[PDB]
Structures are given as structure tokens and as C-alpha cells.
């Protein structure tokens, strides 16, 4: 979609010429969640159409005279400023387009689960525990210092998260994860606002070992 | 003609190119890698066969402007049509191309690491023209820069010295590639790159500095997709096993290997240990097998497929305790006589 | 011209090619297979269409200089730009190549091993403006450089892939400084002498005991399948 | 040209080809099958359309020299290219070859029973 020049050789050609892209793309869809990217979809602009709200009919009223008038108006507006910057949307239109694109995109339901798991306070001795003890303590529901009906400092906020810790403690799975599982968990962790973006190696426990993980900052949560 | 259109002023723009046009952090690694990439482009222009197997990879946001910045540097010779690394057509697509962008690393998904290395590191393009009668033998005058949005794009860990990731950020960009990367500015950049290359015109001048290479290795590992199995294998291997451990049945082998003691209680003496008859009761592991990992560490009972043990062997080799040659030894009732490694924990228990 | 540029004095360099340059083992198998590989190279140069389906494969770390040594041996006619091995256009990529190197960075798929077997097994190429111009010679000799220790999967591929284990800190001569064109030219002259002592494809085969212990090496470099031991324990 | 280059002296070496070169047992089955196989080879080079459904499979150790004996039999017309029986590529690799060898019966692993039976 974003390409501006196509470099290729015609059927009966002398050289692989560079062809500027004179075509403009429009898509028509019936699915609602047609955007499958979670990182971002700035180029796409979903327009939600609805029959019975159409004051005119494209089957009868869109005569070539009307479309010629529309394209003449477009040429006038463009000639007011013949630049690529002019093609860009309005500042308010861009803000609304961000919301529309996230509305018409697919969601990663794992991100909310991860965020909820990271919000649980953990015992001060969490890392010096057996895997079963970790699963027992982390899975309970629970005033920077906490008092979960105990002495102050018995429960603290999480500071390290590993994909294998998610796989073994949050999901309570003894199965060995395929690399595509941990890739999805890593993407979910990166999309989490509490979690950072750069992994640093640290040792976690008996079932997890010394593995690359994120430093998690819950400043957004408890404030 | 563009490179020599104007003499370089002396403003030193190329080092901070992606630093102030794309927001890349002001590291020594970023400066050195961008400078070396610009010199490599100028070298491939002036020495069409010069060796260059590096490539820049720009990571950042959707709106940061990575592709626009590459397009401005490429100008008329910018290439956006390298969507694959296979077949004879791409070599024809690289004819009038100088700065080539693997947009979104789309080719990476289709291709294998060997194909990527062969395509990046080639020197000549042997193909006959459309209407010609003889093969033409064009040297490779193109230099490759890829742009990506995924953080962990280096899925392989065998060949990764070629790719040099750069992390961009729009909020950090002091300038804007959209209106500030004018053709005069890129001309002044490439003039400076030509001056630096002319100061020492050789293919070894395009290699990164020693400090730059030291940071480059760390950055490539930080952008490389890690294997989390090796940590679990190491933690399992670091557990002291009781003496007379191979004479136990598999059922009690699992419970002996899954009784984990804290590393403070070892009370070691180099080799002996009292985990609290005690000094000789437990001993460090001497050997480990992929099937023992499958049956004891993972507590599995189904028969494992070949790829499971291939992955386990790769993890065991990546472990710093196990060697690389495998010896045949008897392990137990469920494992039998197997080829396994000789684990040496010398790096461990030095604490 | 290069092979006959200068005669061969008595120095015995052919046997210790990868031993003292890539830190291989001073073993009879290593010496014999390296010598037979150099003889096969110079034979493919001199007797172009010949039967030589063997392939030296070098195992080592990321920097033992195996690719560098292969490139030093190949010179201008060294080739590495071959990544696919099935089809018809691949035979065009062999035109100016003498020593073709297949580098395995990541583990090859099961199909690629069969592809390289069927590729190195050929002794003739067909290309094309009339008379079908069958490029019969096929001067190419193939060497592989692998990163994984266990690269052999099928039992079919054995007896044709001859692995050599290359280590570092034990290489007498650095491949980056000591493999000069003079030394490699002298080595190829020595190979010419040895092959001309018996110009036949049967002279490119290994010694009987060399082959029988090559079987041991090929077993030591192959996947183990790990199930025969468990069944043996069950039977015992 | 090679077959009738020299007339045949009565040495009787066809029925024991694999018997005394690959060590197979001296059964009547072995002699009959190898004799009929060589007769079928000569037939197919003389009568191209002749119907010969048989093909000999040599099972043995890895050093008995099955491939070597087959290559010596075939001569310049020996083929080891075949690797599967699927598609027209096998037919295209089966044109200029008098004798074709199924190396390690790899094709038998990559093809169905019906496919190999039909081919
Ligand atoms: N003339 C322009 N002036 C200012 N901003 C522009 C202009 N043209 C495009 N943009 C914006 O620049 C961004 C796109 O720039 P690109 O070069 O496509 O960025 P990118 O980060 O390489 O994108 P992808 O999607 O990751 S390939 C969007 O925010 C556009 O709206
Ligand atoms: N003086 C030198 N010249 C060239 N390379 C050197 C030198 N000193 C050290 N090296 C390293 O030696 C290695 C050369 O190996 P190569 O021939 O490029 O590939 P390789 O040795 O086959 O390793 P792989 O596994 O195939 S990538 C690189 O890692 C270089 O960094
Ligand atoms: N001069 C020789 N005398 C006896 N055996 C030899 C001689 N040269 C090679 N060999 C052996 O013969 C075998 C050659 O393999 P092939 O020619 O394919 O016959 P093969 O025994 O059927 O092997 P495969 O793997 O089954 S095809 C190897 O085992 C060599 O060790
Ligand atoms: Mg882009």
C-alpha cells in the first residue's frame, strides 16, 4: 500500500524500468474486524457505511457527470497546494482516525490478562520459593508499601517478569512451550504499559532459571 | 555527479543522520554504524565490486518516517521492490538501484539466513540483457537498508553479525525527514561520506570500530529472539544429584531431581558438599542426556518425537556447562544406554 | 595455468591442509580425505567429467576460518553464491566456479540435504544458440561448512559426506595469513602429481581402512534417534 | 552396439551375477530373477514397449557394493537421479537412462503404494 515506485520489467521490455504508482487503492469489506495488525494501522481508513441512511443511490445518481464534478473539485482543492503534505489528514481527523483504526482492528486478549497478573502484589520472598509455592502465592487475589492484611513489606510490587514465568505461573502449565507461544507472550508483555521494552537477563526460580525478562514498573497502577 | 556536485562544507552530518532525523539515541554505536553505512554506499558507487556484507535495520514507530528518510537518501535510485531473496529476477531489479530498502523485512519472512547472506554479500549479478546476446556481469553497486516495526526481528542466532539494528523514536527527532532531507542536504551528506572514504579507500575502512563492534554484538543479541529453554536446562543441571543416582528407578529419579534446595545451603568445598554421610551423599552432575531431560526434567511419559530431542540437544549445547561431543553411557531404566553430554559445572559452584 | 605455473618440490602439504590450518586432528582419516579432496579438485580440472561424489564438510565455531580457508583455496574461482540446488538454472551458476562452498548457518531442512546430494552427484550439465551445448565438463568440486555439530540426518547421505572437526587454538598456521597463493599453488601442484600417478576416478576413492573409519566418523556426526537404547533397556 | 560388439562365449555368467559379486545365496530364485532381469534389460533396449513389471531390490549391508555393481552394469547409461515417483519430472529424468537405481529406496518412502505400483 505504501509503495510509491514499482521497479520491474514489462512483458516486451528492454530494462527493468521504475514505474511511479499512479493508482489509488480503495477496499470494500463486509467483516468488521478486518485489520489484523496490533502495532498500528495508520495507512488504513475504515469508513463504516450503512444503507437506509443514504440520501442518494450510487446505482442511479453517480452518473459520469457527477464523478467528473467531484474530481474537478478534488483538482481545485489539490491545486490550492500541490504537495504530498496537503494529502495528509487534519490534526483532529488524525486523532479520530487513530481511534477508528484501533476500533476496526483485532485485539490481543492476552495483554489484559498479563496486565491483571502483573498487578497482583507478591510476597517479599517470592523469588526464593519453589515453583508450586509461586503458583500458590501468585494466584491469590492479592493501602509503594502494601498491607494485604499482614505486616508492612510482606507483600511488594512486582519488579521482574519473564515469558516463562507467565507460561509456568500465570497459566500454571507444566507443558514445555513452543517458541511461538513465548513469542506471543513477549509481544503481549511489550504491549503492556507496565512492562518495559528491553529485556535484561536475571535468574527467576527453579522452574524458570536464568532467563531474559523485563523490568516491570507499576507506577501507573498504584497511583 | 551528485556526489561531486558540491564540495563538502565541513558540517559533519552523516554521523548524526538517523540521530537527529529519526531520533536514534546518541550512542557511539549509532554514529559509527551510520557513518560506515554512508561510506559503504559511496564506496559501492566508486568501487562497484567492493565487499560489503553489512546492512542497517531501522526499528521504530509507524509514523517515525524511516522509509521517507531512506527514500530521500536514495532519490531517483531508491529501490522498494525487493520483496524476496530468491530467483533470478531480483538481481535484474537491482540494476538502477543504489539505496535498496527491504521494506518491513518482508523478504526476511520468505527467505532463509543462508539466502539472506548470499544476497547481501554478493558482488556481481550475472545475467543476460533482455535483447542482448552476451551475459553482462554487472558488479553490485547497491547497498541495503531495511526498515522494521517488530522489535525482535532477528529470529536466528547463527548468522547475525551482518545486521546492525538502529532504534528510532519520533519524539527524539530534532529535525524531520519529510521537509528537512532536501536533495541539497543528502548531497552534502554524501559529499562528506566521499571525503571520509577517500581518506582511506579500502574495503576494511567500512568495518566498524572495535568499541562500535563491541556495542554492535550486544545490540544484535538484544534484537535477537532468545531461547528460554537453555535457562531451564541450566537450572536443572545446577541441582546437586544424590550419590548413587543412576541406580535409582525413573519414578524416584524424578522425585530426587525435583527436590530443590536453595543454593545457600550447599556448604560446598569445591566438589564436596553438605546440604544439611552428608558430605558424600550429594554430588554435582557428571553427565546428562536429551532423553533424561525429556523424562526427568519435563516429567514426560509419551515417546518424544525427533524434533523435541533436536531442540533439547540445541539447548544443551547452548548451555555453558555441557560440552559439544557426546559419549554413550547407561542412564537408567527409562532412558537406557544413550548418547549424552559430559556436564562440567566448573563455571558454577565458583561462588 | 596456475596448477602448472610452478612444479612441486618435496614438501608434503596436501595431507596437512585442514589439520594445521583449521586445527583438525592429525588422523589418518583426515589426511587421507583432504588429500583425496585435493586430488579430486585437480582431477575435475584436468579430467573434467569425472565421478567424484564426495564432499568435505568442515565443522567449527563461528570464527575458525573455515570459509576463509576455502576462499583462499578457491581464489578467483571460489564460489559461495549457490543456495538452492534443485532446478535447471543452478547449472548456470557453476560456469566460472571451481571450488563451490555450501555454508550451513542454520540447520538445513530435510529436502536441502537430498538436494545437495543430487546436485553433487551429477557429472554433467546441459545448457542451451544451437546443438544444445551440453556443458559436459562440470569442473566444480564442493566443500560444505556447517555450524551445527550434528548435520547428518539420513542414513542415505552417509558414505558421501566426509566430516572434519575443526578446532581453534591448535591450528599451527593461521588461514588468514598463511594460505597464500604460492602455498595453495604448490599444494595443487602436489595434487596434480599424485593424481597423475594414477589418472582414474578409482584413485579418488578413500583407502579401505580410511573408508571403514570414515563410517565411524559419519556415525559420530549423525542424529542418534535415542530410541534404540530405551528399547534395549526394556529388552534387557 | 555394445551388446553385440562381441559374440558371447559360453561362460554362463548371467545367472550368478549377484551371487558371486554381491554374495547372495545360490538359490534357484536368485539365479532365475537375475537372469530374467538381464533378459528384460536387453528386451527393453531392443523392444521398447515390452511389458516387464519386475524390478530387483538388492538388500544388504552398507559395504557390499550394490551401487558399484549396478553402476558397472549400467555403464555410461546408469542413473541415480530418481528420488520420487510423483509428477512428470521422474518421466523426464527417465528418458536417456538404460538402468535407473532407486537409491536407498528413498522414493518408496516419499510415495504412496499405488503411485509406486503404477510407476
Ligand atoms: N509530506 C509529509 N509531511 C509530513 N509527514 C508526512 C508526509 N508524508 C507522510 N508523512 C507522515 O509520515 C508517516 C509515514 O512515514 P513513513 O516513512 O511511511 O514511516 P515508517 O515508520 O517507515 O512507516 P512504516 O509503516 O513503519 S513502513 C505518517 O505519519 C505520515 O502521515
Ligand atoms: N585477521 C582476520 N581476518 C579476517 N577474519 C578474522 C581475522 N581475525 C579474526 N577474524 C574472524 O574470523 C572469522 C572468519 O570466519 P569466516 O571465514 O568469515 O566464516 P567462518 O569462519 O566459516 O565462520 P562461519 O560459522 O562459517 S559464519 C570472523 O568471525 C572474523 O571476525
Ligand atoms: N577397492 C575397494 N574394495 C572393496 N570395497 C571397497 C573398495 N572401495 C570402496 N569400497 C567400499 O565399497 C562401498 C562403496 O559404496 P557403494 O559403491 O555405494 O556400494 P554400497 O556398499 O552398496 O554402499 P551403499 O551405501 O549401500 S549405496 C563402501 O563401503 C567402501 O568402503
Ligand atoms: Mg515504511
Torsion of CA C71, C75, C80, C86, to 10 degrees: -130
User: Alpha-carbon distance B27 to B214, whole Å?
Assistant: 12
Ligand 1 atom showing the smallest separation from residue B66 Cα:
22
Q: Which residue's CA is minimally distant from atom 15 of ligand 1? A: B65
As given in the structure block, the three cell numbers for residue B128 are 543476460
Query: SS in 3 state form for C33-79?
Result: HHHHHHHHHHHHHHCCCCCCCCEEEEECCCCCCHHHHHHHHHHHHEE
As given in the structure block, the three cell numbers for residue C62 are 563461528
Residue corresponding to grid cell 547428518: C152
Which of B118, B122, B306 minimises the CB distance to C225?
B306
Which of A15, A85, A209 minimises the CB distance to B232?
A209
User: Alpha-carbon distance C187 to B30, whole Å?
Assistant: 45
User: Alpha-carbon distance C139 to C121, whole Å?
Assistant: 13
Please name the residues in contact with B329: beta carbons below 8 A apart, sequence gap of 6 or more: B287, B337, B338, B340
Furthest-apart CA atoms within chain B: distance in Å: 88
Which of C149, C227, C231 minimises the CB distance to B317?
C149
Helical spans, DSSP H, in chain B: 17-21, 28-46, 66-74, 89-93, 106-110, 113-120, 177-180, 183-198, 210-222, 229-237, 250-257, 278-281, 290-292, 306-318
- Select from C205, C173, C185, C219 the least CA-distant residue to C64: C173
Number of other residues whose CB lies within 10 A of the CB of residue C4 = 11
Q: Vertex C104, ends D83 and D62: CA angle to 5°?
A: 45
User: Alpha-carbon distance B228 to A186, whole Å?
Assistant: 11
User: Alpha-carbon distance A170 to A166, whole Å?
Assistant: 5
Do residues C172 and C20 lie in contact, with contact meaning Cβ atoms separated by under 8 Å? yes
Residue C202 DSSP one-character state: G
Do residues A15 and B95 lie in contact, with contact meaning Cβ atoms separated by under 8 Å? yes
B174 touches chain A (CB under 8 A): no
Please name the residues in contact with A142: beta carbons below 8 A apart, sequence gap of 6 or more: A120, A121, A148, A155
User: Alpha-carbon distance A121 to A138, whole Å?
Assistant: 8
Residue C90 DSSP one-character state: G
Do residues A170 and A185 lie in contact, with contact meaning Cβ atoms separated by under 8 Å? no
- Sign of the four-CA dihedral B234, B235, B238, B240: negative
Determine the 3-state secondary structure of A177 from DSSP.
coil
Please give the distance, rounded to the nearest whole angstrom, from the Cα atom of residue C202 to the centre of ligand 3.
Answer: 11
- Select from C68, C57, C76, C79 the least CA-distant residue to C160: C57
Q: Which residue's CA is minimally distant from atom 27 of ligand 2? A: C62
User: Alpha-carbon distance A105 to A39, whole Å?
Assistant: 10
Beta pairing partners, B283: B241
Nearest-10 crossing angle of helices C28-46, C208-220: 110
For a mutational test of ligand 1's pocket, the pick from B61, B68, B83, B166, i.e. the residue with the most ligand atoms closer than 8 A to its C-beta, is: B68
As given in the structure block, the three cell numbers for residue A171 are 497459566
Q: How far apart are the first and last CA of chain B?
A: 64
Q: B237: which chain A residues are within 8 Å (Cβ-Cβ)?
A: none
Helical spans, DSSP H, in chain C: 28-46, 66-74, 110-120, 181-196, 208-220, 228-235
Beta pairing partners, A6: A19
Residue corresponding to grid cell 554492535: B216
Reading phi first (left if > 0) and then psi (alpha if -120 to 50, else beta), residue D104 is in left
Radius of gyration of chain D (CA): 15
Ligand 1 atom showing the smallest separation from residue A85 Cα:
1
* Residue D36 exposure: Cα atoms within 13 Å on the Cβ side: 12
User: Alpha-carbon distance D62 to D59, whole Å?
Assistant: 9
Q: Please, which chains are in contact with D (at least 3 CB pairs closer than 8 A)? A: C
Here the contacts of D54-62 (C-beta below 8 Å, separation 24 or greater) are D55/D102, D56/D18, D57/D102, D57/D105, D58/D18, D58/D22, D60/D22, D60/D23, D62/C158, D62/C159, D62/C215
Q: How far apart are the first and last CA of chain A?
A: 42
**Ligand 1 pocket, residue B145 CB under 6 Å:** no
Q: Do B118 and C80 touch (CB under 8 A)?
A: yes
Do residues B222 and A199 lie in contact, with contact meaning Cβ atoms separated by under 8 Å? yes
Strands A210-216 and A160-162: antiparallel
Q: Do A16 and B260 touch (CB under 8 A)?
A: no
Strands C78-79 and C161-165: unpaired
Going from the C-alpha of B148 to that of each of A7, A56, B36, B56, B61, the distances in angstroms are: 21, 44, 20, 11, 9
What one-character-per-residue DSSP string does D31-55 give?
A: HHHHHHHHHHHHHHHHSTT------
Q: C101: which chain B residues are within 8 Å (Cβ-Cβ)?
A: none
User: Alpha-carbon distance A103 to A120, whole Å?
Assistant: 29
* Residue A88 exposure: Cα atoms within 13 Å on the Cβ side: 11
- Select from B109, B57, B107 the least CA-distant residue to B85: B107
As given in the structure block, the three cell numbers for residue B281 are 551423599
User: Alpha-carbon distance D119 to D74, whole Å?
Assistant: 21
Please give the distance, rounded to the nearest whole angstrom, from the Cα atom of residue B101 to the centre of ligand 4.
Answer: 9
Going from the C-alpha of D28 to that of each of B87, C209, D57, the distances in angstroms are: 55, 35, 17
Exposed/middle/buried for C188, CB within 10 Å: 0-12, 13-18, 19+? buried
Chain CA centroid to CA A171, Å: 22
Residue burial A173-188, b: 16+ Cβ < 10 Å; e: rest? eeebbeeebbeebbbb
Read off φ and ψ for residue B57, nearest 5 degrees: -125, 120
Please name the residues in contact with A122: beta carbons below 8 A apart, sequence gap of 6 or more: A137, A138, A155, A156, A157, A158
Strands B99-103 and B143-148: parallel
- Select from C148, C176, C144 the least CA-distant residue to C68: C176
User: Alpha-carbon distance A36 to A53, whole Å?
Assistant: 28
Going from the C-alpha of B142 to that of each of B38, B43, C204, the distances in angstroms are: 12, 10, 43
Going from the C-alpha of C138 to that of each of C80, C101, C120, C123, C200, the distances in angstroms are: 16, 15, 10, 6, 16
Do residues B33 and B212 lie in contact, with contact meaning Cβ atoms separated by under 8 Å? yes
Torsion of CA A36, A38, A39, A40, to 10 degrees: 60
Which of A6, A7, A197 minimises the CB distance to B97?
A7
Do residues B317 and B233 lie in contact, with contact meaning Cβ atoms separated by under 8 Å? no
Residue corresponding to grid cell 478534488: A74
Please give the distance, rounded to the nearest whole angstrom, from the Cα atom of residue A88 to the centre of ligand 1.
Answer: 10
Going from the C-alpha of B176 to that of each of A40, B145, B259, B276, C12, the distances in angstroms are: 21, 19, 60, 66, 65
Going from the C-alpha of A17 to that of each of A181, B102, D60, the distances in angstroms are: 44, 19, 60
Strands B337-340 and B327-330: antiparallel
A153 touches chain B (CB under 8 A): no
User: Alpha-carbon distance B9 to A35, whole Å?
Assistant: 48
- Select from A213, A134, A116 the least CA-distant residue to A172: A134
Exposed/middle/buried for B342, CB within 10 Å: 0-12, 13-18, 19+? middle
Residue corresponding to grid cell 539466502: B115
Q: D81: which chain C residues are within 8 Å (Cβ-Cβ)?
A: 118, 121-122
Determine the 3-state secondary structure of C144 from DSSP.
strand
Do residues A199 and A192 lie in contact, with contact meaning Cβ atoms separated by under 8 Å? no
Residue burial A206-216, b: 16+ Cβ < 10 Å; e: rest? bbbbbbbbbeb
Q: Vertex B114, ends B53 and B140: CA angle to 5°?
A: 40
User: Alpha-carbon distance D7 to C97, whole Å?
Assistant: 45
Q: Vertex C100, ends C94 and C101: CA angle to 5°?
A: 140
User: Alpha-carbon distance D86 to D79, whole Å?
Assistant: 17
Going from the C-alpha of C84 to that of each of A123, B86, B297, C135, D99, the distances in angstroms are: 56, 9, 39, 20, 28
Q: Do A199 and B227 touch (CB under 8 A)?
A: no
Please provide the size of chain A in residues. Answer: 223
Residue burial B251-281, b: 16+ Cβ < 10 Å; e: rest? eebbeebbebeeeeebebeeeebebeeeeee
Please name the residues in contact with B177: beta carbons below 8 A apart, sequence gap of 6 or more: B21, B22, B65, B68, B69, B72
Determine the 3-state secondary structure of B261 from DSSP.
coil
What one-character-per-residue DSSP string does B321-341 give?
A: SS-S--EEEE--TTT-EEEEB
How far does the CA of residue B76 sit from the closest CA of chain C (Å)? 29
How far does the CA of residue C211 sit from the closest CA of chain D (Å)? 10
Exposed/middle/buried for B187, CB within 10 Å: 0-12, 13-18, 19+? middle
How much of chain A is helix, strand and coil, in % rounded to 5?
A: 35, 15, 50
Determine the 3-state secondary structure of B139 from DSSP.
strand
How much of chain B is helix, strand and coil, in % rounded to 5?
A: 40, 15, 50
Q: Do D104 and C158 touch (CB under 8 A)?
A: no
Do residues C41 and C34 lie in contact, with contact meaning Cβ atoms separated by under 8 Å? no
How far does the CA of residue B196 sit from the closest CA of chain A (Å)? 31
User: Alpha-carbon distance C46 to B309, whole Å?
Assistant: 46
Structural biology method used: cryo-EM
Determine the 3-state secondary structure of B3 from DSSP.
coil
Determine the 3-state secondary structure of B103 from DSSP.
strand
Q: A4: which chain B residues are within 8 Å (Cβ-Cβ)?
A: 71, 80
Nearest-10 crossing angle of helices A179-191, A109-118: 70
As given in the structure block, the three cell numbers for residue C65 are 576460518
User: Alpha-carbon distance B305 to A178, whole Å?
Assistant: 14
Radius of gyration of chain C (CA): 18
Ligand sitting nearest the alpha carbon of C69: 2
What one-character-per-residue DSSP string does D68-112 give?
A: HHHHHHHGGGEE------SSSHHHHTSSS-SEE--GGGHHHHHS-
Strands C78-79 and C99-104: parallel
Chain CA centroid to CA C180, Å: 20
Number of other residues whose CB lies within 10 A of the CB of residue A80 = 8
Identify residues of B whose CB sits under 8 angstroms from chain C CBs.
Answer: 86, 88, 112-115, 117-118, 121-122, 126, 156, 158-159, 289-291, 303-304, 306, 309-310, 313-314, 317, 324-326, 330, 332-339
* Residue A53 exposure: Cα atoms within 13 Å on the Cβ side: 3
Strands B55-59 and B163-167: parallel
Amino acid at each position: 500500500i505504501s509503495a510509491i515506485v514499482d521497479i520491474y520489467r514489462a512483458s516486451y521490455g528492454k530494462r527493468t524500468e521504475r514505474h511511479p504508482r499512479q493508482c489509488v487503492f480503495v477496499g470494500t469489506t463486509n467483516n468488521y474486524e478486518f485489520l489484523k495488525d496490533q502495532t498500528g494501522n495508520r495507512r488504513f481508513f475504515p469508513i463504516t457505511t450503512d444503507k437506509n441512511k443514504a440520501t442518494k443511490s450510487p446505482f442511479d445518481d453517480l452518473t459520469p457527470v457527477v464523478v467528473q464534478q467531484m474530481f474537478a473539485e478534488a483538482r481545485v482543492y489539490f491545486d490550492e497546494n500541490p504537495t504530498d503534505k496537503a494529502l495528509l489528514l487534519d490534526k483532529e481527523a488524525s486523532e479520530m482516525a487513530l481511534k477508528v483504526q484501533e476500533a476496526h482492528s483485532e485485539k490481543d486478549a492476552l495483554v489484559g490478562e498479563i496486565e491483571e497478573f502483573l498487578e497482583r502484589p507478591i510476597p517479599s520472598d517470592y523469588w526464593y520459593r519453589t515453583l508450586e509455592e509461586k503458583r500458590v502465592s501468585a494466584h491469590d487475589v492479592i493501602i509503594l508499601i502494601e498491607l494485604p492484611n499482614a505486616k508492612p513489606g510482606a507483600y511488594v510490587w512486582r519488579d521482574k517478569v519473564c515469558s516463562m514465568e507467565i507460561w509456568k505461573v500465570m497459566m500454571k502449565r507444566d507443558d514445555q512451550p513452543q517458541q511461538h507461544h513465548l513469542r506471543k507472550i513477549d509481544k503481549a508483555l511489550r504491549n503492556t504499559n507496565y512492562c518495559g521494552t528491553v529485556k535484561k537477563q536475571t535468574r527467576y526460580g527453579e522452574g524458570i532459571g536464568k532467563q531474559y525478562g523485563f523490568s516491570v514498573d507499576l507506577a501507573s497502577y498504584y497511583k | 555527479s551528485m556526489i561531486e556536485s558540491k564540495s563538502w562544507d565541513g558540517i559533519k552530518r552523516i554521523e548524526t543522520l538517523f540521530i537527529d532525523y529519526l531520533g536514534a539515541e546518541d550512542n557511539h554505536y549509532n554514529r559509527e554504524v551510520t557513518k560506515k553505512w554512508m561510506m559503504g554506499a559511496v564506496a559501492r558507487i566508486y568501487q562497484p565490486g567492493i565487499k560489503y556484507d553489512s546492512m542497517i535495520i531501522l526499528y521504530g514507530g509507524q509514523g517515525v518516517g524511516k522509509s521517507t528518510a531512506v527514500s530521500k537518501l536514495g532519490g531517483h535510485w531508491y529501490n522498494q521492490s525487493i520483496k524476496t531473496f530468491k530467483g533470478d529476477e531480483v538481481y535484474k531489479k537491482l540494476q538502477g538501484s543504489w539505496i535498496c530498502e527491504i521494506e518491513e523485512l518482508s523478504a526476511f519472512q520468505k527467505s532463509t539466513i543462508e539466502d539472506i547472506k548470499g544476497f547481501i554479500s554478493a558482488i556481481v549479478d550475472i545475467y543476460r540483457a533482455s535483447y542482448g546476446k552476451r551475459t553482462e556481469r554487472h558488479p553490485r553497486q547497491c547497498v541495503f537498508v531495511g526498515t522494521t516495526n517488530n522489535y525482535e526481528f532477528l529470529k536466528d542466532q547463527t548468522g547475525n553479525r551482518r545486521f546492525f539494528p538502529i532504534t528510532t523514536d519520533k519524539n527524539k527527532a530534532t529535525k524531520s525527514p519529510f521537509d528537512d532531507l532536501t536533495p541539497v542536504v543528502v548531497q552534502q551528506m554524501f559529499a562528506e561520506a566521499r571525503v571520509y572514504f577517500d581518506e582511506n579507500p579500502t574495503d576494511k575502512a567500512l568495518l566498524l570500530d572495535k568499541e562500535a563492534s563491541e556495542m554492535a554484538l550486544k545490540v544484535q543479541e538484544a534484537h535477537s529472539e532468545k531461547d528460554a529453554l537453555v535457562g531451564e536446562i541450566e537450572e536443572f543441571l545446577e541441582r546437586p544429584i544424590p550419590s548413587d543416582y543412576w541406580y535409582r528407578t525413573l519414578e524416584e529419579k524424578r522425585v530426587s531431581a525435583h527436590d530443590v534446595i536453595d543454593q545457600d545451603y550447599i556448604k560446598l568445598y569445591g566438589d564436596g558438599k553438605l546440604i544439611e554421610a552428608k558430605p558424600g551423599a550429594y554430588v554435582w552432575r557428571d553427565k546428562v542426556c536429551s532423553m533424561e531431560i525429556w523424562k526427568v526434567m519435563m516429567k514426560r511419559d509419551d515417546q518424544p518425537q525427533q524434533h523435541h530431542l533436536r531442540k533439547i540437544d540445541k539447548a544443551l549445547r547452548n548451555t555453558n556447562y555441557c560440552g559439544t561431543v557426546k559419549k554413550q553411557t547407561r542412564y537408567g531404566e527409562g532412558i537406557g544406554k544413550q548418547y549424552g553430554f559430559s556436564v562440567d559445572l566448573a563455571s558454577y559452584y565458583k561462588n
